[PDB]
Write a protein that binds this ligand. Structure first.
Ligand SMILES: [Mg+2]
Ligand SMILES: [Mg+2]
Ligand SMILES: [Mg+2]
Ligand SMILES: [Mg+2]
Ligand SMILES: [Mg+2]
Ligand SMILES: [Mg+2]
Ligand SMILES: [Mg+2]
Ligand SMILES: [Mg+2]
Ligand SMILES: [Mg+2]
Ligand SMILES: [Mg+2]
Ligand SMILES: [Mg+2]
Ligand SMILES: [Mg+2]
Ligand SMILES: [Mg+2]
Ligand SMILES: [Mg+2]
Ligand SMILES: [Mg+2]
Ligand SMILES: [Mg+2]
Ligand SMILES: [Mg+2]
Ligand SMILES: [Mg+2]
Ligand SMILES: [Mg+2]
Ligand SMILES: [Mg+2]
Ligand SMILES: [Mg+2]
Ligand SMILES: [Mg+2]
Ligand SMILES: [Mg+2]
Ligand SMILES: [Mg+2]
Ligand SMILES: [Mg+2]
Ligand SMILES: [Mg+2]
Ligand SMILES: [Mg+2]
Ligand SMILES: [Mg+2]
Ligand SMILES: [Mg+2]
Ligand SMILES: [Mg+2]
Ligand SMILES: [Mg+2]
Ligand SMILES: [Mg+2]
Ligand SMILES: [Mg+2]
Ligand SMILES: [Mg+2]
Ligand SMILES: [Mg+2]
Ligand SMILES: [Mg+2]
Ligand SMILES: [Mg+2]
Ligand SMILES: [Mg+2]
Ligand SMILES: [Mg+2]
Ligand SMILES: [Mg+2]
Ligand SMILES: [Mg+2]
Ligand SMILES: [Mg+2]
Ligand SMILES: [Mg+2]
Ligand SMILES: [Zn+2]
Lengths: 151, 138, 237, 208
RNA sequence: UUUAUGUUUU
RNA sequence: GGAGCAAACCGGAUUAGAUACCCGGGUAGUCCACGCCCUAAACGAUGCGCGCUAGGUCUCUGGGUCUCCUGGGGGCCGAAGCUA
RNA sequence: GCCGCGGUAAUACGGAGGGCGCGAGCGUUACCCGGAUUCACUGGGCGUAAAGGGCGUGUAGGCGGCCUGGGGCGUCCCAUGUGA
């Protein structure tokens, strides 16, 4: 049911007398392409193990992706740390235009047609966290009005 | 002092909604009310009422928020997430009718002052006019 | 029957902390005199009312409340009032993770059962003079923090905190998990993150024994047969 | 111009039989029957998790190889499809299908896309009555494709027209087998055409 | 209160 | 104008050398008037004016119907928010 | 081309076999735009990263509180001419 694509595996290292002790970390995406996505960052002493908690943590953080016909409802821009992502909806029949990080997320979530650009810091970890927040903050014509009426 | 009376307002609102305050006093002007109107008519505020502080005219603005949420940060959503000045005193911004903004794909309002009065992205496109572009809200 | 008057709320249930406040506590505060902010007890009603509405509804669907206070004031009025309900509670220190990690901290409960059997049994005396005292000492403190947490091997839909500030940990612990949070909160803390609010003195045992006491009663009534007054006054004043 | 030399290295390489062949890629060899791995010294070695670009490359090459078309032209058509109003994935696929040499294959006057190429450039084909030798030629709705007059002999034709009976041609196409001819009825809608391709990627390729 | 320094690329 | 101090300079030490560090001397200068010079870690490394966004505490200094409140300064800790 | 390869096992040099990409072309060099929100109007900044003027007073210039009329310069609308 859920799909796992993963944008980041990397080896960090710390230092102790006599050598550099390593460790690994993994950015993993999780989704059904029905509009359900999640992202988590796992870190453990080996790649597969860390890919594991990647998935684990991934499902512990998720979001509604209020598609309209494969695009999003409206243009959104969000910044996490120094990194910034611009999300604009494109009419169906376009494509999904983004870099590796904002694509994998956006594409597992549905979204066959969208336009984007990464601005500021292109760091993939911090760009991912900013892409979720810019999905998470999306709102449709409905929750718009359920917001402002009175009552 | 206040070089921009209008921008000052939208900022007093922005700053209250951030702290979740019932209302805020925003010293009064005709043209500030006409704008403060469109904010209730379109539902970003419960509404205002003319009042008095030290015999000095003010407009109390009553603030709308969303429902208490859950998870940590148990704090309401925003009825006004975003309010900011387009054309300001430093650079004035005028748009013809074909040139009027799209704000949030239509999910939101763009307040713009025209010869027919203070209108909104739609209202002006409907009258077919355009004019100075006050600000944008969602 | 259930309720409380504003008369017995006068033992001293209005205010503790003076100037020590947390100004988000405005709505529930009346006036300042002689140091302490005196906490409005008419709102304490409208709230104690709406609060209990969630407790009563919860108890009669068979859900659980988890009891927390670590203070000197709120300790012995937890153990008693909690067992008398049949609910779980934390008496001594609140172990970090006890909610977000139920899984690993509860593996420490199993060891409590594993220690209870083996007290005297068809095993023990065969383990040398060292090991016995060792294991039983591991039981002693084990029973100390985990006595009241031993019950309810699944995690609750509520907790009841004496001072929402004295364990901030807990309130957020549960809040991260969607677990609703209800507590007795004076000027010490902010209404904010507490989901069902009991705005009264969280010190001065007279207040914590009174508000928790008749709050344990409300739980038996949705179970059945509210009973005669349980231990409250012991060393009291 | 068009690619020449070994075909089965492509049947393979890509890793899916694309039938660049005659009856053979149907036999128990597309060569992909015996050896379902990429050509050369390294084919049997354990593969690497492919680059995101590597996947879009292979996909594009698959589709492009199927029609036996030079990249010069293959991209002409992709830019056309983009400038045209439409879903831009399928307008590309329609435009490709609408080639004389592709139709003359789909309608089976010849067995392979390549046999259907030399067939046109040799004068053995006709469109709307006219001699047309250019494989790149378009056909829109309503056109009549037919074998030529002098060309109805040559066992090659009627050896391949015979074998047509019993096979149902494409919804967008029609063929009268006794009179050796067909009509291009309409644009071959996405679903109407299942290739092995995911055409999405072929687009995500050219956006650099 | 005596000390200064440690060839090049890995 | 010149008491003390002290670049330069001389001497005693130190050191492999010691144009330095330590010690004994010591002249511009340090001070005053007038006139120049116009630099600086001239630093909060934070331009100026205005409005708006919790509080806690220490302090200087006015006014108060002087257990508190109010105004202008100087410090710490901090809400929201900002920040790599 | 940038990070960098070659110090007697070099997927980095040279040949080979094999493979990838284009194909009457394929490469190289030079130059323009692009990616560069890296001159930022759209769309950046200035405590410690490059960036607050040493501090004042003030000329021009820029900006400018509340109420009501007059003009209609900006602005906005329509029509029309021109926009080869
Ligand atoms: Mg930034
Ligand atoms: Mg950058
Ligand atoms: Mg980079
Ligand atoms: Mg198009
Ligand atoms: Mg392009
Ligand atoms: Mg030397
Ligand atoms: Mg060295
Ligand atoms: Mg000397
Ligand atoms: Mg000497
Ligand atoms: Mg010597
Ligand atoms: Mg030395
Ligand atoms: Mg000396
Ligand atoms: Mg001297
Ligand atoms: Mg001199
Ligand atoms: Mg400077
Ligand atoms: Mg300042
Ligand atoms: Mg200045
Ligand atoms: Mg003073
Ligand atoms: Mg006084
Ligand atoms: Mg002050
Ligand atoms: Mg501070
Ligand atoms: Mg904070
Ligand atoms: Mg050798
Ligand atoms: Mg070798
Ligand atoms: Mg070697
Ligand atoms: Mg190379
Ligand atoms: Mg070589
Ligand atoms: Mg070869
Ligand atoms: Mg070769
Ligand atoms: Mg060329
Ligand atoms: Mg700018
Ligand atoms: Mg910059
Ligand atoms: Mg500045
Ligand atoms: Mg600097
Ligand atoms: Mg300065
Ligand atoms: Mg200045
Ligand atoms: Mg200067
Ligand atoms: Mg000035
Ligand atoms: Mg002036
Ligand atoms: Mg004015
Ligand atoms: Mg002026
Ligand atoms: Mg006027
Ligand atoms: Mg015209
Ligand atoms: Zn084959």
């Amino acid at each position: 049911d859920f799909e796992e694509k993963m944008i980041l595996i990397r080896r960090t290292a710390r230092m102790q007398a006599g050598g550099r002790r390593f460790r690994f970390g993994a950015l993993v995406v999780v989704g059904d392409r029905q509009g359900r996505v999640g992202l988590g960052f796992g870190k453990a002493p080996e790649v597969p193990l860390a890919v594991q908690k990647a998935g684990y943590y991934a499902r512990r953080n998720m979001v509604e992706v209020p598609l309209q016909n494969g695009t999003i409802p409206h243009e959104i821009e969000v910044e996490f740390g120094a990194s910034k992502i611009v999300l604009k909806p494109a009419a169906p029949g376009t494509g999904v235009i983004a870099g590796a990080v904002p694509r994998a997320i956006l594409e597992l979530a549905g979204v066959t047609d969208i336009l984007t650009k990464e601005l500021g810091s292109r760091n993939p970890i911090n760009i991912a966290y900013a892409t979720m927040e810019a999905l998470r903050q999306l709102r449709t014509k409905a929750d718009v009005e359920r917001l402002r009426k009175g009552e | 002092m206040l070089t921009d009376p209008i921008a000052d307002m939208l900022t007093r609102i922005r700053n209250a909604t951030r702290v979740y305050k019932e209302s805020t006093d925003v010293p009064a002007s005709r043209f500030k009310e006409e704008i403060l109107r469109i904010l209730a008519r379109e539902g970003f505020i419960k509404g205002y009422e003319r009042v008095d502080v030290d015999g000095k005219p003010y407009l109390r603005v009553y603030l709308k928020y969303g429902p208490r949420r859950q998870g940590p940060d148990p704090r309401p959503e925003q009825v006004i997430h975003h309010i900011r000045r387009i054309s300001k005193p430093g650079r004035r911004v005028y748009v013809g009718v074909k040139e009027i903004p799209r704000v949030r794909r239509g999910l939101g309002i763009a307040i713009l002052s025209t010869s027919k009065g203070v209108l909104t992205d739609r209202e002006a496109r409907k009258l077919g006019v355009g004019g100075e572009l006050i600000c944008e809200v969602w | 029957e259930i309720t409380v008057k504003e008369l017995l709320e006068a033992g001293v249930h209005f205010g503790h902390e003076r100037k020590r406040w947390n100004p988000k506590f405005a709505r529930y505060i009346y006036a300042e005199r002689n140091g302490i902010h005196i906490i409005d007890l008419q709102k304490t009603m409208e709230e104690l009312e709406r609060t209990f509405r969630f407790i009563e509804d919860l108890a009669m669907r068979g859900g659980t409340i988890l009891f927390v206070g670590t203070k000197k004031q709120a300790q012995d009025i937890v153990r008693m009032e909690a067992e008398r309900a049949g609910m779980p509670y934390v008496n001594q220190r609140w172990l970090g993770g006890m909610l977000t990690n139920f899984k690993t901290i509860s593996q420490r409960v199993h060891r409590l059962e594993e220690l209870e059997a083996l007290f005297a049994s068809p095993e023990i005396e065969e383990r040398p003079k060292k090991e016995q005292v060792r294991l039983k000492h591991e039981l002693e403190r084990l029973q100390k923090y985990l006595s009241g947490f031993r019950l309810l091997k699944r995690l609750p839909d509520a907790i009841f905190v004496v001072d929402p500030t004295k364990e901030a940990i807990a309130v957020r612990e549960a809040r991260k998990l969607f677990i609703p949070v209800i507590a007795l909160a004076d000027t010490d803390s902010d209404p904010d993150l507490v989901d069902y609010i009991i705005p009264g003195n969280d010190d001065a045992i007279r207040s914590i024994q009174l508000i928790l006491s008749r709050a344990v009663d409300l739980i038996i009534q949705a179970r059945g047969g509210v009973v005669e007054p349980s231990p409250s006054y012991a060393l009291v004043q | 111009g068009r690619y020449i030399g070994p075909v089965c290295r492509l049947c393979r390489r890509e890793g899916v039989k694309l039938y660049l062949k005659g009856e053979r890629c149907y036999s128990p060899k597309c060569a992909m029957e015996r050896r379902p791995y990429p050509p050369g010294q390294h084919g049997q070695k354990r593969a690497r998790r492919p680059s995101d670009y590597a996947v879009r490359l292979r996909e594009k090459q698959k589709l492009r190889r199927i029609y036996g078309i030079s990249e010069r032209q293959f991209r002409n058509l992709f830019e056309e499809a983009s400038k045209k109003k439409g879903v831009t994935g399928s307008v590309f696929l329609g435009l490709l299908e609408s080639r004389l040499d592709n139709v003359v294959y789909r309608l089976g006057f010849a067995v392979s896309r390549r046999q259907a190429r030399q067939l046109v450039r040799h004068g053995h084909i006709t469109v709307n009555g006219r001699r047309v030798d250019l494989p790149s030629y378009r056909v829109r709705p309503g056109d009549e494709i037919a074998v030529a007059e002098k060309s109805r002999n040559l066992e090659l034709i009627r050896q391949n027209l015979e074998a047509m009976k019993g096979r149902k041609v494409g919804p967008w196409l029609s063929l009268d087998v006794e009179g050796m001819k067909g009509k291009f009825l309409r644009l071959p809608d996405r679903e109407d055409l299942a290739l092995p391709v995911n055409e999405q990627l072929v687009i995500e390729f050219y956006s650099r």
